[PDB]
Amino acid sequence: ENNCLNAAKACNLNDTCKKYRSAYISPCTSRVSTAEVCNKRKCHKALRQFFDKVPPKHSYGMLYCSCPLGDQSACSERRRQTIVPACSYEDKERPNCLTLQVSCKTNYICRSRLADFFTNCQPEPLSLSGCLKENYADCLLSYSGLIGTVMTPNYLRSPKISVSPFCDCSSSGNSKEECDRFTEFFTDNACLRNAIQAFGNGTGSEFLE
Amino acid sequence: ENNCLNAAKACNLNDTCKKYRSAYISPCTSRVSTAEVCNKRKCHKALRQFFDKVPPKHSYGMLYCSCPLGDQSACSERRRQTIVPACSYEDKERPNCLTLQVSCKTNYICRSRLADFFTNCQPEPLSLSGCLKENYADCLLSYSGLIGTVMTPNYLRSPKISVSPFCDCSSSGNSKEECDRFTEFFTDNACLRNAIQAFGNGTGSEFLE
Amino acid sequence: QGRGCLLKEIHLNVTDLDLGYRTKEELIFRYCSGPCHDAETNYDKILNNLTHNKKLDKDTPSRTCCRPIAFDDDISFLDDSLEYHTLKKHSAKKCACV
Amino acid sequence: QGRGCLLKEIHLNVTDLDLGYRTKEELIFRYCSGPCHDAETNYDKILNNLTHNKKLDKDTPSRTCCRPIAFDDDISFLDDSLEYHTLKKHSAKKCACV
Ligand SMILES: *[C@@H]1O[C@H](CO)[C@@H](O[C@@H]2O[C@H](CO)[C@@H](O)[C@H](O)[C@H]2NC(C)=O)[C@H](O)[C@H]1NC(C)=O
Ligand SMILES: *[C@@H]1O[C@H](CO)[C@@H](O[C@@H]2O[C@H](CO)[C@@H](O)[C@H](O)[C@H]2NC(C)=O)[C@H](O)[C@H]1NC(C)=O
């Protein structure tokens, strides 16, 4: 079955999830000027409201739905469309990730949410969970907390599960290693990968639920 | 044709007359206690409102409609029912007319309206009109002005046109002549009779319209 | 918009109402009539499609109606037995798509 | 009183709405249904009698309708072409005799 489609059905059949899902799809798809497809501010704000007010079983059910193929499938494209990336994510200019990090750290909430993500999803390859903090739920909470900030992450078009904020390491200068470490915490994080996979499984894991 | 029925039809087809006609028929037919068929106060008040706010062509058309028979006919009974006499007129106790006149003269409006009636409908048999003031409209105005006071008059069951307030001259004592003069100004008044008849005619008389 | 739902009127005898009164009095009866398809919603469209789809089994829910939102003044009349009657909320005064 | 006009619901696919969308998403459609004859007026009775009397020629004015007075929250869904759509005033939230 299409797990992402099943999660969308379950959401529209729940009064709370249906209301707040539409409450962000409308501003994230409503053009308000001839220059921008959306009001990106209101799109991020309503996205933050969705994950704050909708219980995780519905909000994580759509964000962390499992698919067999990570690209080109109907599952995976629906999952990629969860945050309405054409407004919330894709942008004309693609900043350097370290430059984006400086900008995020000047926002009190963005700085707070980014610190929680780096703390709660920290890898530890000695752990059977792959995380330093063997609590997948806290990692999934911290990661989903980034949605609606300038650090909004989304699934990349890859055969595996790989996510990243809208940035890259082009033109990093003498800080190429530091930038690559930053992105790899998103794109190649066994703790985050295990946490996302453990939720999609929908089973009683030792480090989740 | 039934002139009183035609006047009732014309009234219900006029927004102003229809509204204020129903505005007095409701309180004059609505029981509000187990002892009285109506609130007589509100019935008189709404009756006064009807003749004050409805143009005379409709209000006089019903009050002064002409019938061939003054009793037992469908015309004349409809005309007698114009003021809803079961509430506005008929009463358990029938006062002496002179006693009723003392009571009326203690009310500023009743005293004013009664003086206008005796002034404007004063007979003068030398006049070709039968009135001292050869202006039938003023007599009809002063008479209709009594409706809604303690002097509320109505058509009596007689072959002729004869009206009277709800009173008589029983137990008048040494003032029998004075009482008989009072009632005769209502019941046997050629000026008032001519004025009522002239309106019912619906023609251009020399002393009306 | 609901511009099609209008206020109409007809001159009738009171007996034409078939309410049991025996009288020769008359009245102007006013009613609301007209289409309301420009004031319909997705709800009304969905209704129309589900009736045709037979998906609502035997419920035939009402789409937007042309109805009175305000009623005319009360009317009174005297019957052949010399009794007065008063009718309330008998005639429309202003219309709307509801 | 209008106690017969109630809020009902049915679980449907979005395609069951026949609005042209191509998607596998679902929804709960809620509608108002039921009789409103205890909330009718002399106006509604007069209508019923004038239809039977043929006195209104071909106007068939509407009597009291069981209709929504408040609509549910907007619903959104993603179609097969990965485009989002939002429907407004598509489902009833509270009913009344109007
Ligand atoms: C009220 O009823 C009267 C009596 O039925 C109606 O007058 C009649 O109208 C019909 C057809 O229009 C005539 O053929 C009858 O001969 C008429 N009868 C009389 C005695 O005139 C009158 O039209 C009705 N009025 C309204 C407004 O409906
Ligand atoms: C949505 O549509 C699906 C697909 O048509 C419906 O599932 C079917 O229901 C019918 C009759 O109830 C079955 O005979 C079909 O075989 C079912 N098809 C499949 C693939 O299961 C489903 O019931 C619809 N859902 C709703 C809520 O209407």
Numbering used by the authors:
A (entry chain A), B (entry chain A): 150 to 358
C (entry chain B), D (entry chain B): 138 to 235
Question: Which passages does the manuscript contain on this structure?
Answer:
RET receptor tyrosine kinase plays vital developmental and neuroprotective roles in metazoans. GDNF family ligands (GFLs) when bound to cognate GFRα co-receptors recognize and activate RET stimulating its cytoplasmic kinase function. The bipartite GFL-GFR complexes are recognized by the RET receptor tyrosine kinase (RTK) forming ternary RET-GFL-GFR complexes (Cacalano et al., 1998; Durbec et al., 1996; Jing et al., 1996; Treanor et al., 1996). RET has four consecutive cadherin-like domains (CLD(1-4)) and a membrane-proximal cysteine-rich domain (CRD) in its extracellular domain (RETECD) (Anders et al., 2001).
The zRGα1a cryo-EM map resembles a figure-of-eight with a molecular 2-fold centered at the crossover point. To enable building of a full structure into the map, we determined a crystal structure of zGDNFmat-zGFRα1a151-353 lacking domain D1 (referred to hereafter as zGFRα1aΔD1) at 2.2 Å (see the STAR Methods and Figure S5C). We then fitted crystal structures for zRET CLD(1-4) and zGDNFmat-zGFRα1aΔD1 into the symmetry-expanded map together with homology models for the zRETCRD and zGFRα1aD1. Some flexibility was apparent within the zGFRα1aΔ1-zGDNFmat. co-receptor-ligand complex itself and had been noted previously. The 2:2 complex X-ray crystal structure in the absence of RETECD has a distance of 127.9 Å between K325 of each GFRα1a protomer whereas in the presence of RETECD this distance increases to 131.3 Å.
